[PDB]
Amino acid sequence: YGTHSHGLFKKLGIPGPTPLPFLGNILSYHKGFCMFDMECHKKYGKVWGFYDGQQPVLAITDPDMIKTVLVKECYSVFTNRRPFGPVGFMKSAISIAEDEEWKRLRSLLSPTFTSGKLKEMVPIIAQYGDVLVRNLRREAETGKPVTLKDVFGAYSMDVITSTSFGVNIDSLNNPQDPFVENTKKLLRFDFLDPFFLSITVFPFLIPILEVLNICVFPREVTNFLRKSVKRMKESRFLQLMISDLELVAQSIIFIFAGYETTSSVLSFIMYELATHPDVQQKLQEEIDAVLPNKAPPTYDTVLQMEYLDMVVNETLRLFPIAMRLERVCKKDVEINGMFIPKGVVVMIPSYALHRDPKYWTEPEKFLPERFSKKNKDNIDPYIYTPFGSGPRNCIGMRFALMNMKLALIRVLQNFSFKPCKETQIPLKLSLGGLLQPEKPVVLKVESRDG
Ligand code: HEM
């Protein structure tokens, strides 16, 4: 044994890197997830396979197959994502839930993320849009070059607290440690770090760890928050959901999926507006045309912003946070002539696709015009997929976008961001399992006549 699934991609006739005995193909992750995926797409073509230990992963690319798994799948065959380390009571989280139990939660929370309940949340988010400008004004006046993800991570926190349970606080290094230390600890998992890398190789550990009540969502923070929710559940997203303890699972997840996820994207965007100060100028004017001098953004003032939408999307093109998109093959099935067997993890190289000469010309270039209607809609969904596609895509995509734009509005309409000393140029991506800069983005911020 040690090499269970290795007979697969040979007997099936699918190309790919040849695996070692217990590791299979992991050492290839020495460059990262996206790095490994670019190489594989180039070399093995449109479809190939590799082994995450003894777990076979088939990477598809033909948009025809992509729609069939991301759409023709509601229990059909594909439906769940790869199961990871000891989850504990979080096995009730919607992003972690499976099969019928998932469809329940999904179609139960959907109401909570409708337009109308969003245009209703705007007021609140705007509130923290202004706090951001205040806190950003300090670092401008002091003349010290700013570290992005810190102000954005604070903004993300501010909006997560208030919208998840109306807990209004000024996270941003001000009353920085009330109920903020817990929340602040809910970061994305780096699946390429020692711990997870081991479990991927030795999945038999999961049942072992779970008996020792070791969970991948630290008991410390989950406990705090589970008791908090109960507190205000009595005092009374929380208000809309309001099982009694499945509710605590969702609430924590939204924070997990929206926190470091938003500030991470936002910091990337402010980076592109540095050696694209020209783009920032256009954006700035577009914001002033719609909203007079420092006019307050409205739910609809945002939708009417072609350029803002172009800058955001093109940023998400180059940097699709969830590098990959994968689903698990529930049963044996063929689909568009291919045949994938039960238990195989179907992967979709989001980052690699978003940077492949086939659909993008000079793909390394940050040029917004791609999304202006004329270049726009000449691009295939299933190819550009930052929030995924189909039934099981980002349930909070719009919210994510609103939030990120509102943050751009007030910010752009008050400051100008230009590079400085430690500001890396070009970029350089980390070789870990998270799509981050590697050496955080630093930008000098100056007030716009203030
Ligand atoms: C920069 C912002 C964000 C990006 C790029 C993003 C991206 C994604 C992606 C790519 C997926 C997987 C889609 C798929 O596999 O088809 C996903 C799932 C999910 N996201 Fe987000 N997301 C963002 C923000 C948020 C926010 C703010 C929330 C909070 C409501 C959220 C909640 C979720 C949930 C619950 C799922 C799981 C859905 C399910 O399996 O039913 N996301 N997101």
Curated annotation (Swiss-Prot):
Cofactor annotation: heme
Pathway involvement of the protein, from the record: Steroid hormone biosynthesis; Cofactor metabolism; retinol metabolism; Steroid metabolism; cholesterol metabolism; Lipid metabolism; fatty acid metabolism
Catalysed transformations (reactions): an organic molecule + reduced [NADPH--hemoprotein reductase] + O2 = an alcohol + oxidized [NADPH--hemoprotein reductase] + H2O + H(+); 17beta-estradiol + reduced [NADPH--hemoprotein reductase] + O2 = 2-hydroxy-17beta-estradiol + oxidized [NADPH--hemoprotein reductase] + H2O + H(+); 17beta-estradiol + reduced [NADPH--hemoprotein reductase] + O2 = 4-hydroxy-17beta-estradiol + oxidized [NADPH--hemoprotein reductase] + H2O + H(+); 17beta-estradiol + reduced [NADPH--hemoprotein reductase] + O2 = 16alpha,17beta-estriol + oxidized [NADPH--hemoprotein reductase] + H2O + H(+)
Documented EC number(s): 1.14.14.1, 1.14.14.56, 1.14.14.73, 1.14.14.55
Membrane listed as a keyword: yes
Xref: SUPFAM superfamilies: Cytochrome P450
Additional free-text comment from the UniProt record: Chimeric transcripts, characterized by CYP3A43 exon 1 joined at canonical splice sites to distinct sets of CYP3A4 exons, have been detected. All are possibly produced by trans-splicing. The chimeric transcripts exist in 3 different combinations: CYP3A43 exon 1 joined in frame to CYP3A4 exons 2-13, CYP3A43 exon 1 joined in frame to CYP3A4 exons 4-13 and CYP3A43 exon 1 joined in frame to CYP3A4 exon 7-13. The longest chimeric isoform (CYP3A43 exon 1 joined to CYP3A4 exons 2-13) exhibits 6-beta-hydroxylase activity, while a shorter isoform (CYP3A43 exon 1 joined to CYP3A4 exons 4-13) does not.
UniProt name for this protein: Cytochrome P450 3A4
Native source species: Homo sapiens
Designated gene of the protein: CYP3A4
